[PDB]
Design a protein around this ligand. Structure first.
Ligand SMILES: *[C@H](C)[C@H]1/C(=C/c2[nH]c(/C=C3N=C(/C=C4\NC(=O)C(CC)=C4C)C(C)=C\3CCC(=O)O)c(CCC(=O)O)c2C)NC(=O)[C@@H]1C
Ligand SMILES: *[C@H](C)[C@H]1/C(=C/c2[nH]c(/C=C3N=C(/C=C4\NC(=O)C(CC)=C4C)C(C)=C\3CCC(=O)O)c(CCC(=O)O)c2C)NC(=O)[C@@H]1C
Ligand SMILES: *[C@H](C)[C@H]1/C(=C/c2[nH]c(/C=C3N=C(/C=C4\NC(=O)C(CC)=C4C)C(C)=C\3CCC(=O)O)c(CCC(=O)O)c2C)NC(=O)[C@@H]1C
Ligand SMILES: *[C@H](C)[C@H]1/C(=C/c2[nH]c(/C=C3N=C(/C=C4\NC(=O)C(CC)=C4C)C(C)=C\3CCC(=O)O)c(CCC(=O)O)c2C)NC(=O)[C@@H]1C
Ligand SMILES: *[C@H](C)[C@H]1/C(=C/c2[nH]c(/C=C3N=C(/C=C4\NC(=O)C(CC)=C4C)C(C)=C\3CCC(=O)O)c(CCC(=O)O)c2C)NC(=O)[C@@H]1C
Ligand SMILES: *[C@H](C)[C@H]1/C(=C/c2[nH]c(/C=C3N=C(/C=C4\NC(=O)C(CC)=C4C)C(C)=C\3CCC(=O)O)c(CCC(=O)O)c2C)NC(=O)[C@@H]1C
Ligand SMILES: *[C@H](C)[C@H]1/C(=C/c2[nH]c(/C=C3N=C(/C=C4\NC(=O)C(CC)=C4C)C(C)=C\3CCC(=O)O)c(CCC(=O)O)c2C)NC(=O)[C@@H]1C
Ligand SMILES: CCC1=C(C)/C(=C/C2=NC(=C\c3[nH]c(/C=C4\NC(=O)[C@H](C)[C@H]4CC)c(C)c3CCC(=O)O)/C(CCC(=O)O)=C2C)NC1=O
Ligand SMILES: CCC1=C(C)/C(=C/C2=NC(=C\c3[nH]c(/C=C4\NC(=O)[C@H](C)[C@H]4CC)c(C)c3CCC(=O)O)/C(CCC(=O)O)=C2C)NC1=O
Lengths: 174, 161, 169, 669, 158, 161, 160
């Protein structure tokens, strides 16, 4: 959380929190009710967002482990997406991205390499999830929540799309 | 020495490209401001002696700097301080006309601190005098042209500090 | 490193003019654009990988010899170094946009950059071109997001170019 | 803004691994000759080199067939080999003799994966097709390179992270093509079972490493808020040379423990100096390490506090240089910023050398990198992401000549980063002579090196302190200068001469021998020896008879072989230019404009043309005319300060009380 | 400042500024105008503050070098009081103790021990100045100003 | 400067004694190699500009150095690099004639590193250029004289690092 | 650090072409000489102390630099000179095994002139010692092996 980060920074330098850090903490405390409301909103819309995002993702990328005819793989993919939405809600509550980093971002690429899931498929799935979250939430709620999904995407966005050394045609598949 | 146009041309030339629309817009801004720059140069040239007189009066006179044992004591050192203020005013006017601070980097601030420390010239008093000169010039040429000249006065002062 | 407010406050004591009218006016002008600076930084951070990828692809389009044998972007090792360094530049430019001051670029990006690039033979022309491409892409994204007065976004990138490019005239 | 430069050391980063390079690098970093096992490895590699060359030649001769086999497996609806661009020889380069004279006209005359979809050549585009074909040919070429090098590193470092750089849409296709190529390659031996094994291994390594999906960058987290965090792609680490890391284990045999201890000595002392200097107390320390009482961390801490370390890396150096060296000895890296130097300087001021050693060893960075059992090792380029701010200083610190430089290299650069251009010659501090009466005294680059280059552009103009010398008529424009040791109005001037013999006693301000000696003392800085004036006697006569002016006499003096031997023959060219300019013009050059002009004159025509250019300059005529011997008119800041060593007049330090009954409380009982 | 602290924290981890840090920076940029008004109030009233506080300080701490009959000592003490009031105003502009700490808290004990000026007398003077300042500020503005006085006092206590 | 004969003379002179038989043998070796040295000097003088042209074509052309923004970009910087290469070739010929590298240390290398660092000249590129020049000279003259000149080219390259 | 194979691979890779017959011939010559190069590396590793002893005896002992006031005076400086000679021999062996001089340029000549000039070590005496070491190595490991070691000995000597 932000309070934990301030305390760790102060303890590293062996000093009490400065007045500015205390004022930032007070602002964070004052924003707590709105943060909790946003987290509740995200929690209540988890299942429908996941379902719609899965539909869009299967429409986009069919050649995926979650669309290989295995029910276990489909359940696991939907569960992973729900987990990432849950971590984003944790970030909303905590005031920073540390829950996301410490639960689902550090080592995420290594985990998916070991499990066997292509990370571009994960990126496309998360883009679909971000689109669904933007569609469902109000513009303010989206403006507050989407940055964490963009933070997730930034981890698994390189190397990859876009590609510009082409003629722009996508029908070359044959 | 580079002015605004030469700086834009240099930035485009290292890339081997013609001036992009952003640099062309900057060039048009410089051309539009050229008339005000010429007017400010004329105004500062017409009042250079008075500007330096007021700067010395409001920042250096009747202090311990002009007293015996001060760095502006004796006529030679007083004249040298006035000459230095003339230098700063003239080169700030040059930089304002060019729209670029490179002239101050290459001809004013290079080795200025070492030279002043070698001679014993007070750096803080020089910075305060430059601030006073900026205030005088702003009162003389107005708020907008005053701020434009103050950009280069502040560049000199920041280089001295 | 310092941000705009810290530098202005310290200069208030340094110059001996204290909190006069010009300082107050500059502080008010800077604080007027603070929310836009935060928004620009958020846009840059949310699209960093896309910006760097687009800029490097356009750079290799305009410098096709870079990826050919004997070029500096030859092989995936050097390609990855290109992407890494462009990410460095974008990150520190976003920092400078937030702070409103170029001291972060001076202390953590440009100090010794020329020495490193001379040691490694990194060409400065393509570096400046890639920085300008990233700047153009960021401006396009900001216009797409609906931002209007984003002149300050030009300041870091251009500045960095002026600091790394050689003197031609 | 950032004009200071730490210099650009010549670095040659490793791009891939070869068997000899790997073996020799491992031997080098341990400071000993090749082992028997390593020599056996080298001999085995060399004896098999002919077979590797034959394999690579076989693959090269059939490169078109192999690439065609790869391309035909994935491309349909076109001819992929039409898009394969071969390298073009650069013929007719300048100086090659291709064109004689200025006449240029006569010179001429395996099952596919499930659901695999092929790629339509026409719809894929010319750009992408050329990309793909060059990629296949490049893969084959690097496979032959790996075969010759005896190491697949050139593949591994260049295909890990390639997936995604090559579009993710076609990664599967790429694999298919590679496998096809592999098949075709294996069709070209079919009789060895060893060459086939090698080709299979290299192709499998390429496929396996290419299949890695977005390998994570190695992050170097800043150790404090004054240090930046960085990232290094895995390819850079893989291609770089390998640090042999030693881990001390109490269960290891005595020989292995002694090897780790020798590594500790080689790192902390830059060399195993323990036997040379009679470090007998080492034995006790070694026991405390071998028995497991203390760790490598405590062993290094005790070594840093030993008398040997103080004798080697504290006594010869100042506090700043000692801190800079201890950074390398206890952290394997140079100092990052001036804030880090400030903290370590405060630590050293408070507690001394043992406190500094404790600050280095007890740091979280030491335990992060070396923990308790790992022997400290040199970090740097290729081991982790490097900073630009301490690039040159750290590269120079890692060299064995680091303890030979006494002037600090880090705090000076870190201080000058925050400052404008220094008061120095545009070509460096080594191009500034001592401003003395005579003698060209310059800082030698290789003796006590302290060069501080700065990025002076061609238009910088130096700030000079006027000496105030000159005749009163040639004053009042720059009369505000004053420099100690200046003979103000004592300039040497000789009015030109205009059928009867002269009187016996005719007196000028200076007698003819006195004026000639003054001219010699100004041009040469000092009086010549007895016979050395012999070559110029006729010239002196022409000066006494009015045939030539003082300007021509000065020009002839500066053109003499004595002047050339004194100030041109054994001097760096621009150092000679600067000194001759100071002697003839009376001032240092302003900047790179004059320096470049005179350097071009020296390059194209030579020394005499340089003398002519200096003497014939309009400024020489303005300042000295035809009848005045030159004199010193400007000095630098350092030259001015060297002539002003007394400041007792400015230390005058800094009455009736202003309060009645001071230092008393109100309403005291 | 908090902007600089956030940028340094992000830089250490080789990452862009996170949404939470950006929200914090936006909040302080929003509060900048209020902090500027408070600092302007401090600056415009600095002479009365120093006058009243110095009179109180010489009442409560008479055995001090400034209160000893030396005109130079008294002038330097008053100059230092004005200096610290202005520094507190500038650090209020910034919004964090960093400028005041960098200019006049780090090494203040060493500087005034070299000058042979008791640091407890300085603590008493800063207490008097803080009381006088709090007399002319609202409680909300005092919540912004007082912690910098307290930081200075803590940095001055032996 | 100092040549082979002067080097042996000074080695004997610091000890205050005549040339010992080993120094006489070295002097005889230099005297016998003088003919080859003169022929090499003639060959290098005849084709000096061609040697520099081939060096630039081999090591510098069509690289990022001559591209826009490079250090050999613009005509003045190209000509300056050519001038430096001409200096290197002429002084390598001088050192080969003299049989000693003393002139190279005195005239060329004492301050070249700091000058190049101040100017921003890539030292690695100029070392590669000097090595390419050594290759060009050894192709023009021959193997033995090419190796003799390459001794001094290698000394220049080592002094540049 | 770079060996002959790396140099040839890089020269072919810059122009983006496979190994042409000339590069294959150079690589073949390097590989075929590898046997005797490893043999003489073994011999030098076995006789390094003797080589240095003979070199010092025939080039530095009983001269002015050993008498007081010389740079080899005092046991510390004698040991330092012997250590420098060992360094030169070991790195010459490295360069021979690599078939390239990059190791010498990277870890010997980089800072050698600065070190020797700051410490006052005479360059000429060191050159004579390196020449004597080259002669001793040639007499020990044979004619051709001695010559191919002397190539790198001369590279070191010319670097100074
Ligand atoms: C009196 C005969 C004439 C005159 C004089 C006048 N002077 C001032 C102010 C200053 N005078 C000096 C003089 C000197 N500084 C030096 O270093 C030396 C050499 C040792 C001298 C002679 C200076 C420095 C000042 C500035 C004030 C200060 O004390 O720092 C004034 C006052 C001008 C003003 O108030 O602006 C006057 C009037 N005036 C006459 O009418 C006489 C002809
Ligand atoms: C006046 C505001 C302050 C002051 C100044 C002072 N300066 C000098 C002497 C010199 N000033 C310079 C500066 C420059 N020369 C240049 O060419 C340029 C660039 C255009 C600059 C900035 C120099 C070189 C000198 C040395 C002497 C000379 O004129 O050549 C003095 C006299 C120092 C002496 O005793 O020699 C003084 C007093 N002093 C103050 O106290 C003011 C705050
Ligand atoms: C004699 C007591 C000792 C001695 C002296 C010595 N000096 C030189 C050469 C130079 N001496 C100087 C000194 C000066 N330069 C100045 O400007 C002044 C003030 C007027 C002085 C005193 C300089 C610059 C040189 C350099 C050469 C020159 O003459 O220009 C030498 C010759 C050294 C050489 O290698 O050329 C000597 C021997 N040496 C002793 O051993 C005595 C104890
Ligand atoms: C065309 C009008 C004439 C001509 C051209 C020609 N050029 C080259 C090669 C080069 N040209 C340059 C030019 C410049 N470099 C600069 O920095 C500037 C200033 C902006 C200029 C004009 C350079 C550096 C080269 C070298 C190659 C490189 O770019 O690295 C050639 C040579 C081609 C070859 O390799 O043989 C030629 C022929 N030829 C004509 O017939 C016209 C008269
Ligand atoms: C060519 C191989 C490389 C190259 C060179 C280059 N040099 C300059 C400019 C200068 N070089 C020198 C160097 C010397 N000074 C000496 O005394 C000697 C020995 C006689 C030498 C070799 C000097 C003095 C200059 C003058 C700088 C000036 O313009 O005043 C340049 C021009 C740099 C500029 O900024 O204009 C260049 C390009 N650069 C390369 O990239 C080649 C690898
Ligand atoms: C006599 C007690 C033992 C003995 C000695 C011995 N020494 C040499 C030759 C040399 N001795 C030295 C000694 C020193 N050099 C120093 O700097 C110091 C410190 C002050 C010392 C002690 C050196 C350098 C030499 C080399 C020759 C020279 O002096 O130039 C020899 C001859 C070696 C040879 O093979 O020529 C001998 C025999 N030998 C014994 O058996 C005694 C126990
Ligand atoms: C012996 C042939 C000559 C001699 C040498 C000598 N050298 C030193 C000191 C040093 N020598 C080096 C050289 C290197 N160290 C390395 O790691 C490498 C690369 C593998 C090299 C080339 C260094 C770094 C030093 C300084 C550290 C040390 O002292 O060990 C000395 C001592 C100098 C002194 O006064 O301290 C000597 C005497 N001197 C001669 O006269 C011989 C001709
Ligand atoms: C080890 C040797 C090596 C190789 C081969 C390599 C490949 C490589 N292929 C690239 C691009 C590319 N490569 C391909 C295509 C393909 N590539 C294939 O191997 C397939 C056969 C084919 C698809 C069927 C395309 C389409 C691009 C351009 C991607 C873009 O749009 O950016 C790039 C990016 C640079 C550029 O765009 O020019 C690299 C580095 N890197 C190396 O270091
Ligand atoms: C935060 C400031 C900072 C910078 C900039 C920086 C740059 C930097 N770029 C490097 C590499 C590299 N950089 C590049 C390429 C390029 N680089 C560019 O900025 C261009 C876009 C492009 C050429 C046009 C290449 C090709 C390499 C590898 C060089 C090699 O082949 O060894 C290296 C050496 C490897 C390492 O240790 O990371 C550094 C230090 N380091 C820093 O700390």
């Amino acid at each position: 959380s932000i309070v934990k980060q301030m305390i760790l920074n102060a303890d590293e330098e062996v000093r009490y929190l400065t007045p500015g850090e205390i004022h930032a903490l007070q602002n964070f405390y004052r924003s707590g009710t709105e943060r909790i409301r946003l987290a509740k909103v995200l929690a209540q819309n988890e299942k429908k967002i996941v379902e719609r995002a899965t539909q869009k993702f299967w429409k986009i990328c069919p050649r995926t482990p979650s669309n290989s005819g295995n029910a276990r793989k489909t359940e696991a993919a939907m569960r992973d997406i729900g987990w990432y939405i849950r971590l984003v809600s944790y970030c909303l509550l905590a005031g920073n991205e540390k829950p996301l980093e410490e639960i689902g971002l550090i080592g995420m690429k290594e985990l998916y390499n070991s499990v066997g899931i292509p990370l571009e498929n994960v990126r496309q799935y998360m883009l679909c999830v971000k689109a669904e979250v933007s569609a469902m939430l109000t513009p303010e709620d989206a403006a507050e929540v989407i940055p964490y999904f963009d933070l997730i995407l930034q981890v698994i966005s390189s190397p990859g799309a876009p590609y510009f050394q082409n003629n722009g045609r996508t029908d070359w598949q044959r | 020495m580079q002015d605004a146009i030469t700086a834009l041309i240099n930035s485009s030339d290292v890339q081997g490209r013609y001036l992009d629309p952003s640099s062309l817009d900057k060039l048009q801004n410089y051309f539009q401001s050229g008339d005000m720059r010429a007017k400010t140069a004329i105004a500062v040239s017409a009042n250079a002696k008075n500007i330096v007189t007021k700067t010395v009066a409001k920042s250096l006179l009747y202090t311990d700097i002009t007293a015996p044992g001060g760095n502006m004591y004796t006529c030679r050192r007083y004249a040298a301080c006035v000459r230095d203020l003339d230098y700063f005013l003239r080169y700030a006017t040059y930089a304002m006309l060019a729209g670029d601070t490179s002239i101050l980097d290459e001809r004013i601030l290079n080795g200025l601190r070492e030279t002043y420390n070698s001679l014993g010239v007070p750096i803080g008093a020089t910075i305060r005098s430059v601030q006073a000169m900026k205030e005088v010039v702003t009162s003389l040429v107005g708020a907008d042209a005053g701020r434009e000249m103050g950009v280069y006065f502040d560049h000199i002062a920041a280089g001295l500090s | 490193m310092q941000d705009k407010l810290t530098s202005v406050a310290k200069n208030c004591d340094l110059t001996g003019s204290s909190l006069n009218r010009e300082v107050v006016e500059t502080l008010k002008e800077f604080l007027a654009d603070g929310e836009k600076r935060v928004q620009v930084a958020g846009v840059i951070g949310s699209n960093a990988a896309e910006i760097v990828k687009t800029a490097v692809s356009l750079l290799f389009q305009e410098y096709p010899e870079l990826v050919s044998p004997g070029g500096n972007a030859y092989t995936t090792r050097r390609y990855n170094m290109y992407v890494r360094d462009m990410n460095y530049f974008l990150r520190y430019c976003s920092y400078a946009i937030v702070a409103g001051d170029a001291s972060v670029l001076d202390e953590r990006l440009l100090a010794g950059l020329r020495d490193t690039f001379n040691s490694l033979g990194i060409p400065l022309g393509p570096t400046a071109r890639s920085i300008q491409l990233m700047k153009n892409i960021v401006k396009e994204k900001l216009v797409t997001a609906g931002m209007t007065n984003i002149t300050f976004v030009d300041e870091p990138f251009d500045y960095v170019v002026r600091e790394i490019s050689e003197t031609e005239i | 803004s950032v004009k200071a430069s730490g210099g650009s050391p010549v670095t040659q980063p490793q791009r891939y691994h070869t068997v000899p390079v790997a073996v020799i690098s491992h031997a080098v970093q341990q400071d000993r000759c090749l082992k028997n096992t390593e020599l056996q490895e080298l001999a085995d590699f060399f004896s098999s080199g002919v077979k590797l060359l034959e394999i690579a030649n076989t693959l090269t001769q059939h490169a078109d067939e192999i690439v065609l086999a790869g391309a035909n497996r994935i491309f349909v609806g076109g001819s992929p080999m039409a898009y394969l661009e071969k390298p073009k020889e650069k013929i007719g380069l300048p100086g090659s003799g291709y064109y004689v004279g200025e006449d240029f006209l006569t010179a001429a005359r395996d099952p596919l994966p499930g659901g695999f979809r092929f790629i339509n050549v026409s719809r894929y585009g010319a750009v992408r097709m050329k990309r793909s074909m060059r990629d296949l040919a490049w893969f084959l070429r690097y496979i032959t390179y790996a075969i010759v090098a005896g190491d697949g590193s050139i593949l591994s470092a260049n295909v890990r992270g390639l997936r995604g750089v090559i579009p993710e849409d076609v990664t599967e296709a790429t694999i298919v093509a590679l496998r096809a190529m592999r098949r075709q390659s294996l069709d070209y031996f079919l009789e060895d079972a060893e060459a086939t094994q090698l080709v299979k291994g290299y192709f499998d390594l390429l496929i396996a490493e290419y299949l890695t999906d977005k390998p994570s960058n190695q992050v170097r987290i800043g150790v404090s808020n004054d240090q930046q965090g960085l990232q290094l792609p895995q390819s850079y680490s893989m291609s770089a040379e390998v640090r042999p890391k030693f881990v001390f284990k109490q269960a290891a045999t005595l020989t292995q423990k002694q090897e780790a201890i020798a590594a500790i000595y080689r790192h902390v002392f830059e060399r195993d100096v323990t036997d040379t200097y009679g470090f007998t107390q080492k034995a006790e320390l070694e026991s405390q390490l071998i028995g497991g009482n203390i760790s490598v961390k405590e062993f290094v801490r005790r070594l840093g506090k030993s008398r040997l370390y103080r004798r080697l890396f504290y006594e010869p150096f100042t506090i700043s240089r000692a801190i800079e060296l201890a950074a390398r000895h206890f952290l394997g890296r140079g100092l990052s910023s001036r804030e880090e130097f400030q903290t370590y300087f405060d630590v050293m001021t408070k507690g001394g050398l043992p406190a500094l050693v404790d600050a280095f060893v007890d740091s979280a960075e030491y335990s992060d990198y070396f923990g308790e059992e790992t022997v400290p090792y040199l970090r740097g380029l290729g081991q982790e992401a490097q900073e630009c701010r301490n690039w040159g200083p750290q590269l120079d610190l890692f060299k064995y000549s680091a303890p030979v430089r006494k002037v600090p290299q880090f705090i000076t650069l870190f201080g000058s980063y925050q400052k404008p251009l220094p008061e120095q010659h545009p070509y460096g501090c080594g191009n500034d002579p001592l401003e003395i009466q005579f003698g060209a005294i310059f800082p030698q680059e290789t003796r006590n090196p302290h060069p501080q280059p700065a990025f002076f552009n061609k238009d910088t103009r130096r700030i000079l302190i006027g000496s105030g010398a000159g005749s009163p008529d040639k004053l009042n424009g720059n009369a505000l200068g004053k420099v100690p040791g200046s003979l103000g109005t004592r300039v040497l001037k000789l009015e030109p001469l205009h059928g009867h013999q002269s009187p016996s006693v005719n007196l000028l301000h200076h007698s003819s021998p006195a004026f000639i000696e003054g001219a010699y003392r100004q041009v040469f800085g000092r009086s010549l020896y007895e016979g050395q004036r012999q070559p110029l006697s006729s010239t002196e006569s022409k000066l006494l008879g009015g045939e030539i002016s003082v300007r021509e006499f000065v020009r002839q003096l500066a053109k003499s072989k004595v002047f050339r031997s004194l100030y041109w023959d054994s001097l760096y060219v621009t150092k000679a230019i600067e000194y001759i300019h100071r002697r003839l013009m009376g001032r240092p050059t302003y900047g790179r404009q004059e320096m470049n002009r005179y350097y071009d004159i020296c390059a194209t025509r030579g020394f005499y043309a340089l003398i002519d250019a200096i003497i014939d300059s309009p400024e020489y005529l303005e300042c000295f005319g035809e009848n005045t011997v030159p004199y010193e008119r400007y000095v630098t800041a350092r030259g001015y300060l060297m002539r002003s060593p007394r400041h007792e007049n400015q230390l005058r330090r800094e009455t009736v009380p202003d309060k009645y009954n001071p230092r008393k409380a109100n309403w005291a009982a | 400042s908090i902007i600089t602290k956030a940028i340094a924290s992000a830089d250490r981890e080789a990452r862009y500024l996170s949404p939470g840090e950006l929200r914090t920076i936006r909040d302080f940029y929003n509060g900048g105008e209020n902090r500027l008004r408070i600092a302007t109030t401090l600056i415009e009233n600095r002479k009365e503050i120093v006058e009243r506080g110095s009179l109180k300080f010489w009442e409560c701490c008479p055995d001090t070098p400034s209160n000893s009959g030396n005109r130079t000592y008294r002038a330097s003490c008053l100059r230092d009081q004005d200096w610290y009031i202005r520094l507190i105003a500038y650090t209020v502009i910034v919004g964090d103790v960093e400028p005041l700490k960098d200019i006049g808290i780090v090494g203040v004990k060493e500087m005034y021990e070299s000058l042979e000026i008791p640091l407890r007398n300085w603590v008493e003077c800063i207490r008097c100045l803080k009381e006088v300042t709090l007399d002319l500020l609202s409680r909300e503005d005092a919540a912004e100003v007082t912690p910098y006085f307290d930081c200075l006092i803590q940095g001055m206590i032996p």
